[PDB]
């Protein structure tokens, strides 16, 4: 519950054989406060690729079943994910993208960890790598939230990344599947924030996307932002 | 916190003996319900109201 931890725990980050130590410790049998205690020391003095291994095997399974059980994330587990985001390189490749590639992520998982991105600071070069990696693969009902909140970061977007996002949008040209409303605010935030960095050929590219894939309510506002967009 | 004809109200006053000075006058809500100051709770102006 509380109090000082034994000193045998504080040497596990610098212990030679973590795998036998962690498996015999039964990480699934730990308490909720143990996640905040363990993640704090495993992201403080531990290296980047090493900490990414800890997130995949321990932190990502423990955050998935808890939100699947109570439909809510515990306070201690919330600060564990806050402390994991202290190292952004290990958290992207250990928590975010493996959840993105799992395919079973839902809205609640997306909307809970998405608020963590908004509430904390992420370096631009680390964040821009998450932009390109999530733009390449396919689109589900949860990864769009990973886009729009990261577009809300208002970072200095690299121009190679801007091609990757519009290629993802140009990929959605001939599909007759209905696009959700949340897809439109993802498009709305994109044309709200990066209207000055889009090209003239990219200007008309999103316009025909509005022609073939319109919305009865939100499409004129997307039309308004495009028509009032300054070139580079 | 609200119960069946029983409530505790916060931020109305900040001292325990403020509500003793304003006890014998009634209370009302925006939605038409009325109430009476029953008893102070203590040290931060909290009271229980009926």
């Amino acid at each position: 519950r509380s109090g000082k931890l034994p000193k045998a725990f504080k040497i596990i980050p610098a212990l030679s054989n973590w795998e036998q130590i962690l498996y015999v410790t039964e990480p699934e049998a730990w308490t909720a406060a143990a996640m905040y205690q363990a993640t704090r020391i495993f992201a403080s003095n531990l290296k980047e690729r090493m900490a990414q291994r800890f997130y995949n095997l321990v932190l990502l399974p423990r955050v998935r079943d808890d939100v699947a059980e109570y439909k809510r994330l515990n306070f201690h587990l919330y600060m564990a994910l806050k402390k994991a985001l202290f190292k952004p390189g290990a958290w992207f490749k250990g928590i975010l993208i493996p959840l993105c590639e799992s395919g079973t992520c839902t809205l609640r998982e997306a909307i809970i960890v998405g608020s963590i991105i908004t509430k904390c600071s992420i370096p631009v070069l680390h964040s821009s790598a998450a932009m390109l990696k999530i733009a390449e693969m396919e689109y589900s009902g949860a990864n769009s939230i990973f886009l729009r909140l990261l577009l809300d970061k208002k970072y200095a977007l690299p121009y190679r990344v801007l091609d990757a996002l519009v290629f993802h949008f140009l990929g959605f040209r001939t599909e007759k599947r209905e696009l959700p409303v949340l897809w439109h605010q993802c498009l709305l935030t994109l044309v709200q924030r990066y209207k000055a960095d889009l090209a003239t050929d990219q200007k008309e590219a999103l316009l025909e996307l509005l022609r073939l894939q319109p919305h009865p309510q939100l499409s004129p506002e997307i039309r308004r932002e495009l028509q009032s967009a300054v070139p580079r | 916190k609200i119960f069946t004809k029983m409530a505790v109200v916060r931020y109305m006053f900040f001292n325990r003996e403020d509500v003793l000075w304003f006890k014998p006058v009634e209370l009302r809500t925006k939605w038409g319900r009325r109430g009476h100051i029953k008893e102070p709770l203590g040290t931060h102006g909290h009271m229980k109201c009926s």
Binding site: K7, K10, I11, A14, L15, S16, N45 | -
Partner: protein, 57 residues
């Protein structure tokens, strides 16, 4: 009784104490991951490791 935050003591040129002129002034850790670069503390009653918390007295 306000909760004041710790401020790390900015020691001026803390790098420039582990050598002279050649050899290492301080001890080196005998562990596998810690050592050959990991200096040890030289306290007045103990020796302490900043990575694996190794303690020699």
């Amino acid at each position: 009784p306000k909760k004041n935050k710790h401020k790390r003591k900015k020691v001026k040129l803390a790098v420039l104490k582990y050598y002279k002129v050649i050899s290492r002034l301080r001890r080196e850790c005998p562990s596998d991951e810690c050592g050959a670069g990991v200096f040890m503390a030289s306290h007045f009653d103990r020796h302490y490791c900043g990575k694996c918390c190794l303690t020699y007295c």
